[PDB]
Design a binder for these strands. Sequence first.
RNA 1: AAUUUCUACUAAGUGUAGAUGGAAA
Length: 1196
Amino acid sequence: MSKLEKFTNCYSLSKTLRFKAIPVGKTQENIDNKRLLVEDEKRAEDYKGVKKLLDRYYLSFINDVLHSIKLKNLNNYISLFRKKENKELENLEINLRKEIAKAFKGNEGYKSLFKKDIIETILPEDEIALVNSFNGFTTAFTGFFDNRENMFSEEAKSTSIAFRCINENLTRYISNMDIFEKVDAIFDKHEVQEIKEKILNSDYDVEDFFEGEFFNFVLTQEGIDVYNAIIGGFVTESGEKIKGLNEYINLYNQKTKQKLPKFKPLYKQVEGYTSDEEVLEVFRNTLNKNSEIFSSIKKLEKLFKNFDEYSSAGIFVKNGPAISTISKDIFGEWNVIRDKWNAEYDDIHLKKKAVVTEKYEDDRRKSFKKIGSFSLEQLQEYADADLSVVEKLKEIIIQKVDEIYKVYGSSEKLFDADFVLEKSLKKNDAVVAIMKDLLDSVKSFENYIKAFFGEGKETNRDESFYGDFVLAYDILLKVDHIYDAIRNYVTQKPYSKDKFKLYFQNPQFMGGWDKDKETDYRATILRYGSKYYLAIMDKKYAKCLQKIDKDDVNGNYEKINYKLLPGPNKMLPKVFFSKKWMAYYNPSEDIQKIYKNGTFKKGDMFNLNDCHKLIDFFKDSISRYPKWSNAYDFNFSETEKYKDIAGFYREVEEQGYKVSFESASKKEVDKLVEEGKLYMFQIYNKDFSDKSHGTPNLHTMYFKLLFDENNHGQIRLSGGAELFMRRASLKKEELVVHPANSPIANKNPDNPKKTTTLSYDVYKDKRFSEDQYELHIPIAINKCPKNIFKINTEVRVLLKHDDNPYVIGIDRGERNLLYIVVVDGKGNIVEQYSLNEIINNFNGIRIKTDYHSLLDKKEKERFEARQNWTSIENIKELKAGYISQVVHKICELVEKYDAVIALEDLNSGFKNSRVKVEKQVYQKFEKMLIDKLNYMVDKKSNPCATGGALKGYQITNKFESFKSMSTQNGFIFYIPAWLTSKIDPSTGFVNLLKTKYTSIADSKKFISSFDRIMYVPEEDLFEFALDYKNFSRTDADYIKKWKLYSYGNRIRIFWEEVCLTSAYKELFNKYGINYQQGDIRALLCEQSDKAFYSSFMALMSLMLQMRNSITGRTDVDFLISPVKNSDGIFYDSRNYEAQENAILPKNADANGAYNIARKVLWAIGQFKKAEDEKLDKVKIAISNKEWLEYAQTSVK
RNA sequence: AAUUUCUACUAAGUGUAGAUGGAAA
Ligand SMILES: [Mg+2]
Ligand SMILES: [Mg+2]
């Protein structure tokens, strides 16, 4: 049989639809008469205004609660913080977090908050007219309620004002208290508390307000601003201009050796993209010469001009990629400080033992990550002698602000306020890109200086630096908000997706659908022939649909009808115990008591007989209930098979749906449209057309099978459909046209037909140049799933009873975009091809489509376009569509082969400089991938068939997070692809040796670590046998014995082509060696010049090098292995390229793909070792040692 | 150079192929 035969009735899915609503008859004229546009347009307009009023009264509410609660744990907290044990402090910090959570939530009203009542009465106390108009429209603000209930939880996020008031502000407060205790000797009694307090408040002393017992009092924003008035100063309502205490420390530069830390301010809490001239004006206003941005930049200039004068111990930079970046900047290469730290740390932890284990490696990397921040002193230690790296980075930011000065001096001409913008933003792209150069210069500077924090939480620190540092940084951070705002106004389309929902004076509109409650819902899907429509009714004619007949007038319609049934588990005890049924039934007192206790629910109170008699009471009460017994010919299953109540809840849930058609008539309700008493919109797409012949949307098929009589098992709508309204963006006159009868030269270079001539004009994007109606319809999938199991485990069960599991290998290549391989469950490769060309199996002749040549044209355009954001979004979404094509090809291969799917993990993965497909692109790839695999249906089949819309394939769980993709989602496998590109598949061979030349002594020991170097004249080759245990870090090998050989040729990057043996022999004849008397390793060691051994190191690098690519031409990018097979031949890619189906791979792409296949093959081999109850606990992530053993042994 | 929307087209001439889950910040 097949292996896809279990992945149906597993779990639910919710989605929606989006469709065109075509006005039919007098409907557009009638809404134009009755003026149903301006009011919800105005409602959408002042929805932001009343939102702002809600924020205003929310600040009123929290300021009302901001006077009451007093805290106690602060007294021990300030001591255990300030006393220079952190797990105990964190355990008490949990108590602090709980106490402030209680102080936030459990007090002071806290009731009429996110309901109807607040906007119904409280905010009334347009503005009153606006709230009256906004009544009963709370659904428009439910999202605001969910958005605005965020501040009171335990989230510790930016939303959390408890985190915001404690975790930074109290800490900075106590540190400022202690700094005040440090510098209180310079504070004079005439200045710092007499004039300032007796002007500001005349309240209690500043030596009172430096106590921890006043932070609870100054928890308000008034305390925040009076704190920052102590720091900096205040206008004080006149021209008095009071001083600040930080300014007193500033004027304590009279000793010219200040060395005092400042005071940190407090964090309080709580726009653009309209016009081009507007955003350029706000750009100039944010970025002018006397702007706060500019002056903070100048502050950084003076600060980091005199940066060399402070504490090297008290300065810190964090961990990240930027430390490797600054390794490249200071010393020249990438991981230099990294392996310097390994050189120290392995002197510490590594003993005199030579081998480094894998656990040593991963825990060493874990320690490297765990040290999240660094003072400069160990960095100077890893630096060599006479290297002021602080002066080095000082000169780096000096030349960075020099280039900033350069872009200023070349770009200030737009800041001429008298100069006017002449053309559009889409026209003056030169100065647009100039502005872009400004912003990316600032962005590169902030990412470069972004390491200069240390994220501490640290020891003693130059806070005299760090306070002014974060003072400049708070101004200079929101440049990103400015950046992506103006990037958005760059990247926006010529149109927009602006839309506004319409209610027609009905808050009870479009929620329920199937039930006879359309006097409130007032809308119903209609059909004639195969053409589907939407009919909407007025309040005065809500029961217009009663007087409808079939009546055989040769005009007939199809009224959607029956009863959906939502929420049965909550609906049934309500309707059966609301006294409208207590009065109709007896009711039985024993089952009333059993329900009001709960002895049928699970949780060690459950009795199966009590549950079953509750079910049979539900049976007889439902069969006696008229509105459900006369709507469903009820046929449940038998009583004794019911294990619980939730299963029968799903049975009544599936039996609460019978949607089909009433036979209506046509002409009288078209007349009711014409009289204005019917509102009438045609459900529309492109595939509703008369011209519709090809392959429509799967979503349209979904819509059809809402009314397929055989879809009882079961796909059906979700209630609560919406309808928005999209006006025009551009004008129909103002479009550029390709005319009737005109030879229009085609764009695809793959069709032999190159020019199109057709007999009607087409416009510029006509659907976007007019005012159109858009319906939005939700859809339900698998509400009552039958086959429930644990997914990945049952996959492993199928693999346990497998005989020969086929597998898809999935990887991006270098000159290839994507590559897919077919391999069996015994490592025998079946099929392989790249996916650069993309073919459609379509009615007449199949035609391929290459995205690769497209991307080459786009990179050419971006080279002659100076990398504008238009090109960036261009190539990004070209990738985004391309991968959507890829995954359709993927799942087509899945339904062909019933295979298993494995991909490069990025939770530990890396990228190597060549594949165009990004981490973000690949992330989008896998997310759309797992979404497509969350339900899999071929359109072309019978929808009722296995694979069709009834019986498709839910093979995976829903997406959780980017970090959640952890080695498995069922058939999905997030693979550590370490050491998987440069790898011999034909034998199982890899180099482990670092071939960068270090020393001549290193060269000589590298020679003598080999045991035999022998020229052979039979093959005209060179024998290179070796033991890996005479080499460092070769622990993962299993064979370790390899006679390397050297025929063929390779490519120097420089591209440059070199053949191996000729290069060897010319070096040996130039340095004077009879090479025909091996072994001569001591004779190689006998040389002394640097040139021979460096060139020899280079030649050895060529020998171990396997991949060559010319990187400009698609063809000549080849591979070559140095070690023969089990029968005496090795593998080159040029000897297996021109093939159709061989056992070999074809390139590095197929190599890595075959690697993936062998990883999951080993995973199945592990599954063939343990018990079925243990397969969940089976560790999955293969390591290098058993990986190479698998590679060397299963190679046969 | 058309589209419920997105991508590549122009497929036999008002579309073709695919992907396509929205409201909320
Ligand atoms: Mg189609
Ligand atoms: Mg397009």
